[PDB]
Symmetry: C2
Protein backbone atom coordinates (compact mmCIF):
# COMPACT_ATOMS: atom_id res chain seq x y z
CA UNK A 1 0.00 0.00 0.00
CA UNK A 2 1.67 3.20 1.16
CA UNK A 3 5.46 3.46 1.10
CA UNK A 4 6.82 6.83 2.24
CA UNK A 5 10.45 7.62 1.39
CA UNK A 6 12.97 10.46 1.58
CA UNK A 7 14.07 12.54 -1.40
CA UNK A 8 17.85 12.08 -1.19
CA UNK A 9 18.24 8.89 0.84
CA UNK A 10 20.60 6.04 -0.04
CA UNK A 11 18.21 3.86 1.98
CA UNK A 12 15.28 5.04 -0.14
CA UNK A 13 17.34 4.30 -3.23
CA UNK A 14 17.76 0.81 -1.83
CA UNK A 15 14.02 0.41 -1.27
CA UNK A 16 13.20 1.69 -4.78
CA UNK A 17 15.63 -0.77 -6.35
CA UNK A 18 14.14 -3.49 -4.14
CA UNK A 19 10.72 -2.70 -5.54
CA UNK A 20 12.16 -2.85 -9.01
CA UNK A 21 13.73 -6.19 -8.17
CA UNK A 22 10.36 -7.38 -7.10
CA UNK A 23 8.73 -6.15 -10.33
CA UNK A 24 11.36 -7.59 -12.67
CA UNK A 25 12.29 -10.80 -10.84
CA UNK A 26 9.24 -12.19 -8.99
CA UNK A 27 5.88 -10.71 -10.14
CA UNK A 28 5.54 -12.89 -13.31
CA UNK A 29 -0.03 -7.47 -8.34
CA UNK A 30 -0.16 -4.11 -6.53
CA UNK A 31 3.22 -2.61 -5.65
CA UNK A 32 3.15 0.26 -3.20
CA UNK A 33 2.92 3.83 -4.49
CA UNK A 34 5.60 6.24 -3.32
CA UNK A 35 5.34 9.31 -1.12
CA UNK A 36 8.05 11.50 0.30
CA UNK A 37 8.61 12.90 3.75
CA UNK A 38 11.24 13.18 6.46
CA UNK A 39 11.39 9.49 7.44
CA UNK A 40 10.95 6.17 5.67
CA UNK A 41 7.72 4.37 6.55
CA UNK A 42 5.25 1.79 5.24
CA UNK A 43 1.56 1.79 6.06
CA UNK A 44 0.13 -1.55 4.93
CA UNK A 45 -3.38 -2.76 5.74
CA UNK A 46 -3.87 -1.47 9.28
CA UNK A 47 -0.26 -2.06 10.35
CA UNK A 48 2.44 0.62 10.22
CA UNK A 49 6.09 -0.34 9.77
CA UNK A 50 8.68 2.30 10.48
CA UNK A 51 12.15 2.89 9.12
CA UNK A 52 14.22 1.01 6.60
CA UNK A 53 14.77 -2.46 7.97
CA UNK A 54 11.34 -2.78 9.33
CA UNK A 55 10.08 -1.71 5.91
CA UNK A 56 12.55 -3.95 4.11
CA UNK A 57 11.55 -7.10 5.93
CA UNK A 58 7.96 -5.90 5.69
CA UNK A 59 8.09 -5.78 1.89
CA UNK A 60 10.09 -9.02 1.84
CA UNK A 61 7.21 -10.54 3.82
CA UNK A 62 4.42 -8.95 1.75
CA UNK A 63 5.92 -10.10 -1.50
CA UNK A 64 7.44 -13.44 -0.43
CA UNK A 65 10.89 -12.75 -1.80
CA UNK A 66 13.08 -13.72 1.07
CA UNK A 67 14.38 -16.87 -0.45
CA UNK A 68 15.35 -14.89 -3.54
CA UNK A 69 16.68 -11.69 -1.95
CA UNK A 70 18.80 -13.66 0.53
CA UNK A 71 19.81 -16.65 -1.64
CA UNK A 72 18.26 -19.45 0.41
CA UNK A 73 18.89 -21.85 -2.51
CA UNK A 74 22.61 -21.83 -1.82
CA UNK A 75 22.18 -21.40 1.93
CA UNK A 76 23.94 -18.06 1.83
CA UNK A 77 21.45 -16.10 3.90
CA UNK A 78 24.14 -15.50 6.49
CA UNK A 79 26.64 -14.16 3.94
CA UNK A 80 24.04 -11.80 2.48
CA UNK A 81 22.92 -10.35 5.80
CA UNK A 82 26.58 -10.10 6.89
CA UNK A 83 27.40 -7.98 3.85
CA UNK A 84 24.37 -5.68 4.03
CA UNK A 85 24.76 -5.33 7.81
CA UNK A 86 28.45 -4.57 7.43
CA UNK A 87 27.62 -1.93 4.83
CA UNK A 88 24.80 -0.32 6.81
CA UNK A 89 26.94 -0.35 9.95
CA UNK A 90 29.66 1.49 8.04
CA UNK A 91 26.91 3.98 7.15
CA UNK A 92 26.97 2.91 3.46
CA UNK A 93 30.48 4.28 2.96
CA UNK A 94 32.87 2.05 1.00
CA UNK A 95 36.62 2.24 1.49
CA UNK A 96 38.79 1.86 -1.62
CA UNK A 97 40.03 -1.47 -0.30
CA UNK A 98 36.47 -2.79 -0.11
CA UNK A 99 36.30 -1.42 -3.65
CA UNK A 100 39.30 -3.45 -4.79
CA UNK A 101 38.03 -6.56 -2.92
CA UNK A 102 34.71 -6.28 -4.60
CA UNK A 103 36.46 -6.37 -7.94
CA UNK A 104 38.48 -9.41 -6.86
CA UNK A 105 35.23 -11.10 -5.77
CA UNK A 106 33.39 -10.23 -8.95
CA UNK A 107 36.27 -11.88 -10.79
CA UNK A 108 34.66 -15.31 -10.68
CA UNK A 109 31.13 -14.66 -9.38
CA UNK A 110 28.52 -13.01 -11.65
CA UNK A 111 27.08 -11.33 -8.57
CA UNK A 112 28.57 -10.39 -5.20
CA UNK A 113 27.36 -13.43 -3.25
CA UNK A 114 25.17 -15.70 -5.37
CA UNK A 115 26.40 -17.62 -8.40
CA UNK A 116 22.85 -17.53 -9.73
CA UNK A 117 21.09 -14.19 -9.55
CA UNK A 118 21.06 -10.72 -7.98
CA UNK A 119 20.93 -10.55 -4.19
CA UNK A 120 19.92 -7.98 -1.58
CA UNK A 121 23.67 -7.44 -1.21
CA UNK A 122 23.98 -6.60 -4.88
CA UNK A 123 21.20 -4.03 -4.43
CA UNK A 124 22.75 -2.43 -1.33
CA UNK A 125 26.26 -2.18 -2.80
CA UNK A 126 24.86 -0.99 -6.12
CA UNK A 127 23.10 1.95 -4.53
CA UNK A 128 26.08 2.55 -2.27
CA UNK A 129 28.62 2.61 -5.12
CA UNK A 130 26.45 4.48 -7.66
CA UNK A 131 36.01 7.35 -14.41
CA UNK A 132 37.85 5.52 -17.20
CA UNK A 133 40.81 4.55 -15.00
CA UNK A 134 38.45 2.88 -12.53
CA UNK A 135 36.47 1.30 -15.36
CA UNK A 136 39.56 -0.48 -16.69
CA UNK A 137 41.33 -1.13 -13.36
CA UNK A 138 38.18 -2.41 -11.64
CA UNK A 139 36.70 -4.08 -14.72
CA UNK A 140 34.67 -6.76 -12.92
CA UNK A 141 32.95 -4.17 -10.74
CA UNK A 142 32.19 -2.04 -13.79
CA UNK A 143 30.73 -5.04 -15.64
CA UNK A 144 28.65 -6.07 -12.64
CA UNK A 145 27.42 -2.49 -12.22
CA UNK A 146 26.42 -2.13 -15.87
CA UNK A 147 24.70 -5.51 -15.70
CA UNK A 148 22.64 -4.54 -12.66
CA UNK A 149 21.92 -1.11 -14.13
CA UNK A 150 20.42 -2.55 -17.31
CA UNK A 151 18.74 -5.63 -15.81
CA UNK A 152 17.22 -4.22 -12.65
CA UNK A 153 16.60 -0.52 -12.84
CA UNK A 154 13.04 0.00 -13.91
CA UNK A 155 9.85 1.78 -12.91
CA UNK A 156 11.12 3.59 -9.82
CA UNK A 157 14.89 3.85 -9.39
CA UNK A 158 17.60 6.53 -9.68
CA UNK A 159 20.13 7.98 -12.12
CA UNK A 160 21.77 6.03 -14.92
Amino acid sequence: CVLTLVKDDIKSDILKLVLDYIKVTVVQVKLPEICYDKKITLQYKNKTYKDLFCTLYALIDIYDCYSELFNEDEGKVSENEEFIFHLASDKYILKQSDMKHLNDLLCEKSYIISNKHASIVDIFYFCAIHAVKERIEFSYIYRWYLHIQETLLANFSTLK
Copy 2:
Protein backbone atom coordinates in the same frame (compact mmCIF):
# COMPACT_ATOMS: atom_id res chain seq x y z
CA UNK B 1 1.83 -18.38 17.56
CA UNK B 2 4.38 -21.15 17.16
CA UNK B 3 8.10 -20.44 17.31
CA UNK B 4 10.72 -23.00 16.41
CA UNK B 5 14.32 -22.56 17.63
CA UNK B 6 17.70 -24.33 17.80
CA UNK B 7 19.30 -26.02 20.79
CA UNK B 8 22.68 -24.38 20.91
CA UNK B 9 22.48 -21.14 19.01
CA UNK B 10 23.18 -17.59 20.00
CA UNK B 11 20.48 -16.44 17.65
CA UNK B 12 17.96 -18.74 19.25
CA UNK B 13 18.85 -17.44 22.67
CA UNK B 14 18.38 -13.92 21.38
CA UNK B 15 14.80 -14.65 20.28
CA UNK B 16 14.06 -16.30 23.64
CA UNK B 17 15.33 -13.27 25.55
CA UNK B 18 13.31 -11.08 23.15
CA UNK B 19 10.18 -12.98 24.20
CA UNK B 20 11.20 -12.43 27.83
CA UNK B 21 11.62 -8.72 27.16
CA UNK B 22 8.14 -8.66 25.67
CA UNK B 23 6.70 -10.42 28.73
CA UNK B 24 8.36 -8.18 31.33
CA UNK B 25 8.34 -4.82 29.53
CA UNK B 26 5.35 -4.59 27.18
CA UNK B 27 -1.85 -6.34 32.80
CA UNK B 28 -4.69 -4.67 30.91
CA UNK B 29 -3.92 -6.76 27.85
CA UNK B 30 -2.69 -10.30 28.45
CA UNK B 31 -1.72 -11.44 24.97
CA UNK B 32 -0.71 -14.92 23.84
CA UNK B 33 3.05 -15.31 23.36
CA UNK B 34 4.29 -17.95 20.92
CA UNK B 35 4.98 -21.52 21.99
CA UNK B 36 8.51 -22.85 21.65
CA UNK B 37 9.84 -25.87 19.73
CA UNK B 38 13.33 -26.97 18.71
CA UNK B 39 14.39 -28.17 15.27
CA UNK B 40 17.47 -27.57 13.12
CA UNK B 41 16.30 -24.21 11.82
CA UNK B 42 14.64 -21.18 13.41
CA UNK B 43 11.09 -20.48 12.18
CA UNK B 44 7.94 -18.65 13.21
CA UNK B 45 4.55 -19.84 12.04
CA UNK B 46 1.98 -17.13 12.73
CA UNK B 47 -1.50 -17.34 11.25
CA UNK B 48 -0.62 -19.19 8.04
CA UNK B 49 2.64 -17.36 7.28
CA UNK B 50 6.10 -18.73 8.13
CA UNK B 51 9.03 -16.41 8.85
CA UNK B 52 12.35 -18.19 8.32
CA UNK B 53 15.42 -16.88 10.19
CA UNK B 54 16.70 -14.69 13.00
CA UNK B 55 16.01 -11.29 11.50
CA UNK B 56 12.83 -12.19 9.62
CA UNK B 57 11.38 -13.74 12.78
CA UNK B 58 12.74 -10.92 14.94
CA UNK B 59 11.07 -8.20 12.91
CA UNK B 60 7.99 -10.41 12.73
CA UNK B 61 7.80 -10.54 16.53
CA UNK B 62 8.60 -6.83 16.71
CA UNK B 63 5.63 -6.11 14.41
CA UNK B 64 3.14 -8.47 16.08
CA UNK B 65 3.72 -7.25 19.62
CA UNK B 66 4.59 -3.73 18.53
CA UNK B 67 7.59 -3.29 20.73
CA UNK B 68 9.74 -1.52 18.22
CA UNK B 69 9.72 1.84 19.94
CA UNK B 70 11.08 0.29 23.14
CA UNK B 71 13.59 -2.12 21.61
CA UNK B 72 15.04 0.66 19.46
CA UNK B 73 14.67 3.62 21.84
CA UNK B 74 12.52 5.71 19.51
CA UNK B 75 11.66 7.91 22.48
CA UNK B 76 15.29 8.97 22.73
CA UNK B 77 15.67 9.03 18.97
CA UNK B 78 18.42 6.43 19.07
CA UNK B 79 17.19 3.93 16.47
CA UNK B 80 20.21 4.40 14.19
CA UNK B 81 22.63 3.77 17.07
CA UNK B 82 20.81 0.57 18.05
CA UNK B 83 20.76 -0.66 14.46
CA UNK B 84 24.44 0.03 13.98
CA UNK B 85 25.53 -1.74 17.16
CA UNK B 86 23.53 -4.93 16.54
CA UNK B 87 24.50 -4.82 12.85
CA UNK B 88 28.16 -4.39 13.68
CA UNK B 89 27.75 -7.39 15.96
CA UNK B 90 25.96 -9.50 13.33
CA UNK B 91 28.57 -8.57 10.73
CA UNK B 92 31.27 -9.77 13.10
CA UNK B 93 29.23 -13.00 13.36
CA UNK B 94 28.33 -12.27 17.01
CA UNK B 95 32.02 -12.62 17.89
CA UNK B 96 33.43 -10.26 20.52
CA UNK B 97 37.15 -9.49 20.68
CA UNK B 98 38.90 -8.64 23.95
CA UNK B 99 39.46 -5.23 22.36
CA UNK B 100 35.70 -4.73 22.26
CA UNK B 101 35.36 -5.70 25.93
CA UNK B 102 37.57 -2.87 27.21
CA UNK B 103 35.70 -0.19 25.27
CA UNK B 104 32.26 -1.67 25.95
CA UNK B 105 33.12 -1.59 29.61
CA UNK B 106 33.87 2.12 29.29
CA UNK B 107 30.58 2.66 27.47
CA UNK B 108 28.68 1.00 30.34
CA UNK B 109 30.49 3.13 32.95
CA UNK B 110 27.75 5.56 34.04
CA UNK B 111 25.00 4.23 31.81
CA UNK B 112 22.68 1.48 33.05
CA UNK B 113 22.33 0.15 29.52
CA UNK B 114 24.54 -0.01 26.44
CA UNK B 115 22.72 2.62 24.40
CA UNK B 116 19.62 3.73 26.27
CA UNK B 117 19.53 5.84 29.42
CA UNK B 118 16.00 4.65 30.16
CA UNK B 119 15.51 0.90 29.72
CA UNK B 120 17.03 -2.15 28.03
CA UNK B 121 17.43 -1.99 24.27
CA UNK B 122 17.74 -4.59 21.53
CA UNK B 123 21.49 -3.92 21.70
CA UNK B 124 21.49 -4.92 25.35
CA UNK B 125 19.77 -8.19 24.42
CA UNK B 126 22.15 -9.07 21.57
CA UNK B 127 25.27 -8.30 23.61
CA UNK B 128 23.84 -10.15 26.62
CA UNK B 129 23.53 -13.33 24.59
CA UNK B 130 26.86 -12.68 22.86
CA UNK B 131 28.89 -12.18 26.04
CA UNK B 132 27.18 -14.88 28.12
CA UNK B 133 29.51 -17.44 26.55
CA UNK B 134 32.53 -15.21 27.20
CA UNK B 135 31.55 -14.42 30.78
CA UNK B 136 30.23 -17.71 32.17
CA UNK B 137 33.88 -18.79 32.17
CA UNK B 138 35.63 -15.50 32.97
CA UNK B 139 37.39 -15.31 36.35
CA UNK B 140 36.29 -13.01 39.19
CA UNK B 141 39.37 -10.77 39.04
CA UNK B 142 38.81 -10.41 35.31
CA UNK B 143 35.02 -10.20 35.72
CA UNK B 144 35.60 -7.29 38.08
CA UNK B 145 38.28 -5.73 35.85
CA UNK B 146 35.36 -4.89 33.58
CA UNK B 147 32.97 -4.29 36.51
CA UNK B 148 30.41 -2.05 34.78
CA UNK B 149 29.78 -4.86 32.29
CA UNK B 150 29.31 -7.28 35.22
CA UNK B 151 26.75 -5.01 36.89
CA UNK B 152 24.90 -4.55 33.60
CA UNK B 153 24.87 -8.31 32.92
CA UNK B 154 23.52 -9.10 36.35
CA UNK B 155 20.99 -6.32 35.87
CA UNK B 156 19.67 -7.79 32.70
CA UNK B 157 19.79 -11.36 34.00
CA UNK B 158 17.60 -10.52 36.99
CA UNK B 159 15.25 -8.08 35.23
CA UNK B 160 14.64 -9.89 31.95
CA UNK B 161 15.24 -13.58 32.22
CA UNK B 162 12.08 -15.47 32.75
CA UNK B 163 10.43 -18.63 31.60
CA UNK B 164 11.45 -18.45 27.96
CA UNK B 165 15.23 -18.16 28.03
CA UNK B 166 17.77 -20.79 28.96
CA UNK B 167 20.97 -18.91 29.54
CA UNK B 168 22.53 -20.06 32.77
